[PDB]
Write a protein that binds this ligand. Structure first.
Ligand SMILES: CCC1=C(C)C2=CC3=N/C(=C\c4[nH]c(/C=C5\NC(=O)C(C)=C5CC)c(C)c4CCC(=O)O)C(CCC(=O)O)=C3CCN2C1=O
Ligand SMILES: CCC1=C(C)C2=CC3=N/C(=C\c4[nH]c(/C=C5\NC(=O)C(C)=C5CC)c(C)c4CCC(=O)O)C(CCC(=O)O)=C3CCN2C1=O
Ligand SMILES: [Ca+2]
Ligand SMILES: [Ca+2]
Lengths: 479, 479
């Protein structure tokens, strides 16, 4: 139900600014927020053309519209206002907000240099997360400023935090995917900054509802005043947050996480600070990408060393199998190739168990089980019990596996094993709950992670797939 | 001779600031530039302790000294001065410069957002070089602002340029290594920013010459006022530049290039702008690193596809050689593995020539030549004539080679070929000249690049070394 709600066309804004829609062609007013008259101090009804009279910035706007710069910004000093417009197809969407009480742009610039210094310093990622979380908590002045890292299921967990102490510390906690639904995650991938200064605000409509130029409702994906999904506002109430301001951390065109800010009282944030909070969220995004690409390479090369040794060992050996387990050197490498505590090489009824494997009978029952599934190339799981309950009786030694068929449906198998790792995912409220209205309970929750191994990396899987290739070629050669 | 000159201990500064050295222990004056009295408006002789009287910022300095932040900055409003200190072992090195006539820090911040936008946009590297070159030429206001990219010999060439037109456009030109000597390149790796506002400045000494605390001359590696090598000042004269300001572009702890600024008249630049010019030079440094790591990976994976096909073809084939050249598919792949126009597989007197190779006799004479050299693993050159003059008579088809011995000193060879590429390295003055005093002539120069191929990439060499590994293993297996 949640996934289906269109959050980008509320036909309404928040109370803390005004909105004016006008046509590229002649800058004629097509739509407007009802409160516009309050900020602009001018009526200009639907059909009216904007002139140097009503809008003294009309000259610099017309200029910006012909240019490439994707967003407009003007300080209406005359009226103490921060103007800002963007392009939506053939439309120009003007947003007006009260300017922030003179902040040092040098101070902003400053703390945006300590990050830029600490970032290119190339220290621990955890440090960088906190050393960004902090500067944002500094320049914003919210009661709580957490960095939030999405996992692959689209749950996330808090990996850094700053805050006065006026709001509870959520550090180290999982929240479920449904808390930031798909259409929300997507919107935040392309619009990297959002603010809700008062949660109890009264939604200001846009009239007409239907833009006369396009013929549809106004698309508000890039409207920074856009009125937020009511269902989220209840969430914020249940959490005891009057204000919030989140920034998207996008790494390689995918949403990595959020810099999320919250306040116990209502809280606003100047156009400038918002623009420095995105800068910090970008600066970090660069670091993260490099940290991730450098970690992968440095693993890929590491595993590469092992595979080059095993590849040479199998070629050099007569029976070849003793290239994989001919001595302590070969056996330890087979296990290090994928970062596994044990492995089983099965050639019909010719079983070989290296390191710490389940019993010969448990592997037999497992290979028949696999055969029943449609396993092409490799099959990898860090929780075997999920699909194979029987495995729950050797989770201690084999909670995760990487399994590969070697012979064309002739019961040949190389299977790696990884023990149970007892984790306590300390959740943030009960995740499974479905009220769907959001949950009132945010009381710290705890479930034990039973019969689940430390997870397989993409390099590990890639190293395994290459070894399959290495073997198949020789097993087809010797057959 | 040039390499030997110590540029980091001139015992002197430039005219446009003052310098004060004082001891960590008690902040007692140990050294001082003779002009200090002019800026500070106080004597404080050698032995004097700094107090809230002579230095009203003494309180915030003492604070900074205990902290981690590696540099100090204070606006002496009282005296219209920009103070800045750094740590040298047990010393604190204060530099004082006149503040810049009130510049918008929001304007600076601005053009440092258009770069940050255009950078994470991930467009063409050439665009990013110009779209940084420009913003620097903007915020500095020098007559010429070139980006300079070091090659592997430590020559460089101009790859972007902005400038009013008051100074000649050097775009696309090589300058020789000796123009930025080794100790200079090294210093600029660890101190990423330098300025010379007037070239004809009168060097202000530091007394005493010998710091009484350390017992040596003052080390001025991180002094932004440090007096520059006279031999460089003559260079600037011969070039017709009264001012300059260069920023180091450091990619992965190595000096990638310089953002260089020059002025026909004397030109100064505010402490702030300098700090934004480094930010731009950093922002870019991040882009470059990613561009380079993403290009490499995307080549490594590409070549990886070919090697996986050839590896499979040799394994699948009986005589195996026809895995490398059994048909158009195998032959084209052998040549695409290294990005070569031709190759020669030589197994004793069993010659095989693919694509566009020299004559069977020219390869014979080349293999004997190689045998005379000490070639372990592979030998790669993009100019064969350099070492093998005879090759100059088949440069059209083989100006560059990658050659690998396959059989243990048993005349087995896989050699790839790359044709001559007629390039005109348009130099910037005569490079070979040695006056060593610098050259007066900066008249655009031209030498033809004869008998030299498009250069081998590290991925290409890496793909070749892996194929050697693939073959040796089978040639030792079949032998
Ligand atoms: C690390 C913990 C954490 C969480 C879990 C969290 C949640 C969060 N939800 C946000 C947005 C939305 N949630 C929802 C919906 C739900 N949230 C829920 O918890 C539930 C049950 C729903 C509906 C199924 C929607 C529609 C939206 C889009 C609002 C808009 O239209 O702008 C948003 C973005 C809006 C904001 O910045 O406050 C957040 C960010 C704040 N935040 C956190 O700091
Ligand atoms: C793209 C073209 C280009 C070049 C080739 C160039 C040269 C350049 N030389 C610089 C510095 C030095 N050259 C030299 C020495 C030489 N330069 C020469 O041309 C020659 C012949 C020498 C001595 C052998 C030295 C010692 C230094 C260190 C100065 C210091 O002590 O701070 C420096 C750094 C000083 C500066 O920023 O002006 C540069 C940068 C400026 N610049 C350019 O824009
Ligand atoms: Ca993640
Ligand atoms: Ca280069």
């Amino acid at each position: 139900s949640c996934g289906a709600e269109p959050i980008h066309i509320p036909g309404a804004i928040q109370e803390h600014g005004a909105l004016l829609v006008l046509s590229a062609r002649e800058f004629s007013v097509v739509q407007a927020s009802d409160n516009l008259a309050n900020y602009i101090g001018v009526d200009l009804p639907i059909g009216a053309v904007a002139t140097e009279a009503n809008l003294p910035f009309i000259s610099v706007l017309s200029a910006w519209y012909s240019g490439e710069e994707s967003n407009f910004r003007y300080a209406w000093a005359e009226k103490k206002l921060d103007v800002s417009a963007h392009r939506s197809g053939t439309l120009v969407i003007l947003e007006v907000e009260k300017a922030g009480v003179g902040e040092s742009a040098e101070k902003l610039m400053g703390e945006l240099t300590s990050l830029a210094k600490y970032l290119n310093s190339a220290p621990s990622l955890e440090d960088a997360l906190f050393r960004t979380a902090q500067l944002v908590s500094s320049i914003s002045g919210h009661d709580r400023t957490l960095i939030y890292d999405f996992g692959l299921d689209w749950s996330g967990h808090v990996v850094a935090e700053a805050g006065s102490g006026a709001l509870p510390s959520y550090l180290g906690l999982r929240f479920p995917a449904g808390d930031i639904p798909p259409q929300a995650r997507q919107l935040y991938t392309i619009n990297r900054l959002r603010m809700i200064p008062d949660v109890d605000y009264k939604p200001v409509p846009i009239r007409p509802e239907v833009n006369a130029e396009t013929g549809a409702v106004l698309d508000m994906s890039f409207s920074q005043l856009r009125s937020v999904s009511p269902v989220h506002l209840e969430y914020m109430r249940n959490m005891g947050t009057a204000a919030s301001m989140s920034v998207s951390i996008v790494v390689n065109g995918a949403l990595w996480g959020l810099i999320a800010c919250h306040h116990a009282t209502p809280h606003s944030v100047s156009l400038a600070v918002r623009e420095a909070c995105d800068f910090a969220a970008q600066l970090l995004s660069m670091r993260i990408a490099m940290e991730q690409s450098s970690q992968d390479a440095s693993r890929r090369v590491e595993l590469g060393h092992i595979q080059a040794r095993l590849l040479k060992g199998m070629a050099a050996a007569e029976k070849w199998v003793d290239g994989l387990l001919g001595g302590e050197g070969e056996r330890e490498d087979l296990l290090k190739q994928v970062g596994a505590d044990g492995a089983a090489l099965v050639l019909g009824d010719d079983y070989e168990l290296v390191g710490n494997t389940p019993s010969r009978e448990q592997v037999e029952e497992l290979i028949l089980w696999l055969g029943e599934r449609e396993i092409a190339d490799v099959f990898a799981t860090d929780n075997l019990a999920g699909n194979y309950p029987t495995a729950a009786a050797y989770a201690s030694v084999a909670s995760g596996i990487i399994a590969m068929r070697v012979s064309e449906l002739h019961g040949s198998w190389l299977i790696w094993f990884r023990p149970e790792v007892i984790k306590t995912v300390r959740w943030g409220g009960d995740p499974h709950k479905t009220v769907i209205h959001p949950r009132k309970s945010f009381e710290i929750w705890k479930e034990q992670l039973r019969n689940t191994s430390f997870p397989w990396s993409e390099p590990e899987l890639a190293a395994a797939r290459e070894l399959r290739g290495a073997i198949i070629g020789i097993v087809l050669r010797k057959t």
